[PDB]
Design a protein around this nucleic acid. Structure first.
Lengths: 463, 463, 87, 87, 87
DNA sequence: CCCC
């Protein structure tokens, strides 16, 4: 009864067509989940799958009208939706899915279970995924040159390893890492190595991501971040030199939220998935227009203190404190990298680092202590704290400090506040941040006389 | 006669397809009212429903042509429209509908009588919808910790209970409530616990609904609450430290109407049916740039005075200005709320709260008496009273206090008004507000004699 | 901008009756803006939203229409009640 | 191919842009008649556009079509009588 | 054909422009009613446009169309009551 | 798509 309905039933039982929340159908032809908005591929799937059906069913699929009828039945059979790209522990290649937690490579129906849509763009070879090869030794030497293995560099090396390993996992990342370094220090070597390692999943973005309005009008620089697993910002137009817009804290906050606000061109949709690790390259100390408790909770830094400079200007990179170590430049490294010689060696190193840091939950951690910009706001947390349980039954001692009691609230004259705050830190070295805080957190008991609803830790610590 | 017309008649008699006022069709597949504008699901419904029809009608529905014919007949048979989501005492779940008025769980046709096009997103578990369990023990322990049952908190407990109960009503609420209180007063814990308890009907927003223009251009942030039931804005931009954007009055006027004017991206539905009680989470008393009689009917305050902190700063948490209670921070609390252990427990608690507050109609009553913003404006409702024809037989007595009688109307000189107002609200302490009120609420009998008609209570009693 | 053309399409209707709460009765009763002050009814809005007065107000409006349904129904301006026209 | 002044001083994304969608696989591009910037009123060429033109792809869509990637094989030659000026 | 004066004072390429796509193979194009620049407040004649209107192919596309190049057979005649000014 |  209705042979074509039975053909549709079998093609449905093979689980080769799925319906997504976008309304599109993702089909499995040629060992990959494909979909196309302007041209469905269900009839291509029917023609390709005609081989697995019984002998009497294969002849009915050589007519375009019958394949269109089968496609109509299949479309009317799909009601429930599914989810795509939900396994962050899997790396999708062009001919399979690699498992980071195990190391084995799956192909065909073994890669079919994970509904992976994006891909790295190149095939996977088992021969090059080995730990004994002169590409491996050369890459290890290069990485040791980039990051010294000294006891002083232990924390920096560890966090560099963690950050580079976290470019494989396909989930949201809660921090933005600063690859602080200088010219000819090897951050470009890391960029090229990572691009060669993860293929099409690596995208490089300019300054517009950092200090420009993300929403504004049209902005393709954000929509490209959809499902990419690494985002790189380079050639930063220094904010230390005046004339450039400061880093927008709201931009960093939006880029850390699991959903990214941003729209493509000629697109009716606004939401695009965010799995990207965002690493910022800089030769220069960063700055922020506004700084809030939520901000320095999403910032970590890596410092590169090794040079590869030509012998002509060696003392030019040797005779000051800013940059510490100087090695010899290598010229053929860029050509060898572009020839993708160490791609699989770097892939093996990345998987090894992930396995070393695959503790049950993967999570990046911020280290705001290494940014002098926050060094004024991470110390004022040790200086100023807000109102808490009970200062009321101790007003006898704070009165002599200059504090005044107003409607059962302890306030402070501005001059007395400055006098109490000037003791721990210099009024000139930190003076700009000082009067910035003064004008930022001043409360008006009136227009003329200003008061503050804060008491120092000093006044709390000192009886 | 015309088998396909009989099939269409039966499918109509099953009451599975309805025509909406927007010009679309809503079909009942997989126990939910789905509808798509870019792909009608009538043929999907026909194929899925072919089982209930008689034996000879079942095989006729295996051809896409005949399904299209039956769909054409069904489209011709639907003339009148229907209204969706018209019941405010219903809680829609993935596997049924919960009755807030009665408490019995519905399924099948019982949930079909009400055309609910939204769901909480999770199935309902009746095995855990009971008043006894160790999750429930922790639940009311935390509830009592957040809000004590003391006599001094009886009114606070009642009003907070009303606010937490009213987020399930599917109707427009005409007032906005503020969750006043200090930091870590249990606002975040109860917020995430309620989000878990309610599911997709809960939505979080930032501050753009309060400190930025709502209408503007395209903004999901005013359109993402289409048929939502609760909106929580947390950690307002504290008004103690000057430098933050003030709350817009026009936005609040926009938000409180039955029909919220506003359009989504590429959507012309400017009639946003709001079923949510907008709850405001703040750290200081609210401030409004513009104040009039419209505010006091739409403002209510909920106060919390708790704290959570580590034992390292226990003494510091117990030795500062303005908390009332300090507890211990829990690092696993976020994971515990994420893993959804108190969902049905607080669902039962909320159904008791709603039921005890289910006196025939849900009403919300503002509490203007807690608003310092009106402390100067309610004062002109109690202390400063205009002068008019009711003072006609009052020529002599009031002229001695500093007033004069002008055409049987008593006035007050501007310098005298300044001096007298400085006695109640100091001309500098609240100088900005005094200047705003002076330039906003002054009457003119002529250009020169600009005198306020407002009369103090003290002088009228004196003969 | 004000010109003679604008003054033949403008009329105003003024309200001079305040409903004020008992707390603020003295201000409204003593205010020059209001010529008469009365009390509040809380359930009036509820019964209006119940559409209780729908047909009664329809009857009132139709009766006013019939009272003004003279063969030509034309709105007439009241230019004396605006201050920008005072000059 | 002879194209317009748009590919230099105007946004390349914009809407559908046939003035760039026709440079797909073209080995020479001549946008002549530079609008001399000595007289005030001529928009300066954006360095962003110069940077984008060198990249091996450009963004541009034809009408009633969905192909947005055009290869850049072009040798951009600009006819002029005056020195170009960038912002 | 009789075209407007967007072909003499405004950029030719811009977006869609059927004022300049209508001179495809026209053997005589007449521009009349010069917006006399004797009074300030009007756009001047761009020498860029004059040089563009002589080359054998004039850039410009119609609405809903992807054809950018038009053949220029036209003898351009400009009617004016006063002597013109060039930027 | 033009059009704003």
């Amino acid at each position: 009864g209705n042979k074509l309905f039975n053909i549709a039933q079998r093609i449905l039982d093979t689980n080769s067509v799925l319906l997504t929340e976008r309304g599109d159908h993702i089909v499995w032809i040629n060992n990959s989940w494909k979909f196309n908005s302007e041209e469905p591929l269900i009839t291509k799937l029917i023609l390709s799958i005609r081989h697995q059906l019984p002998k009497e069913y294969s002849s009915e699929l050589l007519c375009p009208r019958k394949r269109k009828t089968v496609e109509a039945n299949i479309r009317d059979m799909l009601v429930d939706s599914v989810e795509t790209d939900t396994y962050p522990d899997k790396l999708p290649f062009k001919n399979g899915v690699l498992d980071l937690v195990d190391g084995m490579f799956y192909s065909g129906d073994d890669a079919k279970k994970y509904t992976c849509t994006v891909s790295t763009g190149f095939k996977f070879d088992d021969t090059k995924f080995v730990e004994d090869s002169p590409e491996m030794e050369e890459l290890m030497n290069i990485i040791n040159d980039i990051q010294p293995l000294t006891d002083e560099n232990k924390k920096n090396r560890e966090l560099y390893e963690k950050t580079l390993s976290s470019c494989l996992c396909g989930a949201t990342k809660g921090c933005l890492t600063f690859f602080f370094g200088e010219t000819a220090t090897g951050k470009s070597t890391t960029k090229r190595l990572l691009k060669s390692a993860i293929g099409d999943l690596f995208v490089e973005t300019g300054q517009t991501i950092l200090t420009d309005v993300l929403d504004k009008g049209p902005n393709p620089f954000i929509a490209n971040m959809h499902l990419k697993r690494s985002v790189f910002c380079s050639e930063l137009p220094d904010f230390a030199c005046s004339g450039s817009k400061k880093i927008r804290s709201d931009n960093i906050k939006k880029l850390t939220e699991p959903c990214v606000i941003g729209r493509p061109c000629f697109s009716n949709k606004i939401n695009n998935r965010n799995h990207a690790t965002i690493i910022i390259d800089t030769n220069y100390k960063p700055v922020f227009d506004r700084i809030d408790n939520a901000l320095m909770r999403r910032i970590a830094v890596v410092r590169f203190r090794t040079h590869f400079s030509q012998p002509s200007g060696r003392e030019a990179a040797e005779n000051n404190d800013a940059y510490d170590k100087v090695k010899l430049l290598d010229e053929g490294l860029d050509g060898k990298i572009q020839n993708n010689r160490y791609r699989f060696a770097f892939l093996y190193l990345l998987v090894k680092w992930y396995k070393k840091y695959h503790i049950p939950i993967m999570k990046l951690y911020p280290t705001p202590e290494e940014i002098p910009d926050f060094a004024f706001y991470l110390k004022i947390g040790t200086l100023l704290v807000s109102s808490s349980v009970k200062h009321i039954p101790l007003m006898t001692d704070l009165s002599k400090k200059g504090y005044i009691l107003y409607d059962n609230v302890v306030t402070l004259p501005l001059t007395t506040f400055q006098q109490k705050i000037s003791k721990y830190f210099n009024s000139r070295l930190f003076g700009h941040d000082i009067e910035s805080f003064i004008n930022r957190h001043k409360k008006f008991a009136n227009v003329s006389d200003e008061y503050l609803q804060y008491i120092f830790i000093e006044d709390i610590s000192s009886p």
